[PDB]
Write an enzyme that holds these catalytic residues in place. Structure first.
Site, short mmCIF file in Angstrom:
data_model
loop_
_atom_site.label_atom_id
_atom_site.label_comp_id
_atom_site.label_asym_id
_atom_site.label_seq_id
_atom_site.Cartn_x
_atom_site.Cartn_y
_atom_site.Cartn_z
N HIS B 41 -2.46 -7.46 -4.41
CA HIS B 41 -3.50 -6.46 -3.66
C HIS B 41 -4.16 -5.40 -4.77
CE1 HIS B 41 -5.47 -3.79 -1.04
NE2 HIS B 41 -5.02 -2.75 -1.61
N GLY B 143 -1.05 5.02 -1.62
CA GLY B 143 -0.53 5.22 -2.95
C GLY B 143 0.85 4.80 -3.51
N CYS B 145 2.34 2.03 -2.53
CA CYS B 145 2.73 0.53 -2.80
C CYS B 145 3.00 0.08 -4.30
CB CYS B 145 1.79 -0.56 -2.37
SG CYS B 145 0.10 -0.21 -2.93
#
Ligand SMILES: *[C@H](S)C(=O)c1cccc(C(=O)OC(C)(C)C)c1
Ligand SMILES: *[C@H](S)C(=O)c1cccc(C(=O)OC(C)(C)C)c1
Lengths: 302, 302
Positions: B41, B143, B145
């Site tokens: 991502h 924040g 991940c």
């Protein structure tokens, strides 16, 4: 989202744990700069424990009676001294992994992380609170004394607790890093027991704010209360009195949620009087008191 | 004595966390040997997220589009590739703090420690369980991940989880270190939701054994049950079926306490049918299912 009992990352403290052996007694020590800190009980023998005179026990020891091992590396002891209930062993090597640190003594109702250790090796990390009666509800087995409790702020480790013993109810007692016990406990064999305890009201209210921040709102109501009416209810349920300073400390969480502190107090009064009626808050069916307002803000914000 | 949700010491994982930035997206990565692992991502933009074609997004990037920072040290990216939902960034420096490690995928009902991190900096450590529905009840903010979950055994870190996202109920989903999601979740924007969950029966029984080891015995009874009669009750209360393998796995705790597994099952049946009547077990007013038999043995033994 989510709310968990979260400890500080433990690596800065892991690099300070060592094993101290005196005679047949082994326990943990904390190596910072060129000093190793550990419980003075390490110099006792099993039959020394009714009324040991630690000054006599220590004068009969020399440096070579203390074996300090850091991992697989033996540290040469070059001096020894007592400070209250801890022993200070000066070693010939400064710990290269010493973090920025402070020795702070904490207040009842404050929380800290515990790095449980055995034989100088870290085993696990968890969060604890100093209870109003100066005990901690830890998780410790034989061999864990000398394990330490700490908080970390901007890379500075504030050590606040060294573990010494287990009381008859299974709760734990220890000292600050200056060797001064928390509470009316001693490092000798007695019938000493935890005194009566109470619930840390300001922490329960902080945790209700955490729950609102995380979407549990069922316990809210349109009511408010005065501080004196609330504190009458607190007294009845063995909760500590709420002060105006506590109200001020909850101000940021109150502003974030839009729920005035005395409005939250009315909710807490209803919960004390009625229970939860089969519902849960933040996955608990009891009112939790081991999170401070700071713990909530650190974990929840935004 | 005592029983706490205890995590593994986090220092070995702390030394592996880095920050990865692509465009305006920053998240955490895991640096082992000369590879940095992170969620793929990181190469998305905000409007890329309905149905991103990650192979197209990646072919449009070069090494210089990835900024990797380890503390205050920038790591030069010299290769990039995708593996399922994670990105592998080859860097020109092997991490000198790489521990012995494995990438293991865990089963529902197993526990692990989570090192929550923001901007490559560790923030806190806590224990989690993989739920039967393949979500985890974590504590994560924007924040986080790329934060990872792990177990440690004899100085070998088995990484089992990388954090990706939060589902609408506030629970969390992620992948294994090979980039394969736990559960029927995807790294795109959909109405995906946690499926129905169940209680991890074998863990509840392990935790009742912990309680007996720690002196809570009020819930014991002279009764026993058969495995089939117990599992009829389990089904009724949305508990998972108990297998004979589960019974075998509880054997050591049964032998330590002297309480046969099916005798403990009779206690659990009574607790499901009657509740606790205002009492607590190990400081909880609910039946706890996030400790495995191994967690109990590790924390309680002796
Ligand atoms: C080992 S954890 C330790 O430091 C210590 C400190 C203070 C008192 C004791 C103690 O009294 O141990 C027994 C087991 C009760 C004799 C131990
Ligand atoms: C950042 S934690 C990350 O890796 C990630 C992975 C998978 C999916 C998402 C995501 O969809 O983020 C939004 C906020 C829902 C758009 C993020």
């Amino acid at each position: 989202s989510g709310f968990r009992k979260m400890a500080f990352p433990s690596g800065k403290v892991e690099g300070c744990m060592v094993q101290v052996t005196c005679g047949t007694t082994t326990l943990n020590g904390l190596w910072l700069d060129d000093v190793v800190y550990c419980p003075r009980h390490v110099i006792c023998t099993s039959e020394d424990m009714l009324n040991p005179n630690y000054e006599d026990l220590l004068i009969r020891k020399s440096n070579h009676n203390f074996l300090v091992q850091a991992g697989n590396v033996q540290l040469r002891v070059i001096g020894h001294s007592m400070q209250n209930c801890v022993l200070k062993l000066k070693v010939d090597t400064a710990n290269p992994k010493t973090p920025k640190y402070k020795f702070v003594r904490i207040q009842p109702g404050q929380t800290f992380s515990v790095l449980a250790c055995y034989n100088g090796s870290p085993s696990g990390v968890y969060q604890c609170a100093m209870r109003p009666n100066f005990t901690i509800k830890g998780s410790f087995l034989n061999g864990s004394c000398g394990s330490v409790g700490f908080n970390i702020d901007y890379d500075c480790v504030s050590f606040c607790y060294m573990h010494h013993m287990e009381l008859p109810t299974g709760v734990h007692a220890g000292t600050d890093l200056e060797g001064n016990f928390y509470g009316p406990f001693v490092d000798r064999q007695t019938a000493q027991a935890a005194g009566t305890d109470t619930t840390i009201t300001v922490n329960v209210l902080a945790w209700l704010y955490a729950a609102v921040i995380n979407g549990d709102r069922w316990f809210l109501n349109r009511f408010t209360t005065t501080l004196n009416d609330f504190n009458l209810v607190a007294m009845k349920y063995n909760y500590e009195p709420l002060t105006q300073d506590h109200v001020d400390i909850l101000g940021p969480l109150s502003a974030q949620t839009g729920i005035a502190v005395l409005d939250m107090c009315a909710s807490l009064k209803e919960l004390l009087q009625n229970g939860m009626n089969g519902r849960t808050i933040l996955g608990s069916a009891l009112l939790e008191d081991e999170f401070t307002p700071f713990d909530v803000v650190r974990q929840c914000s935004g």
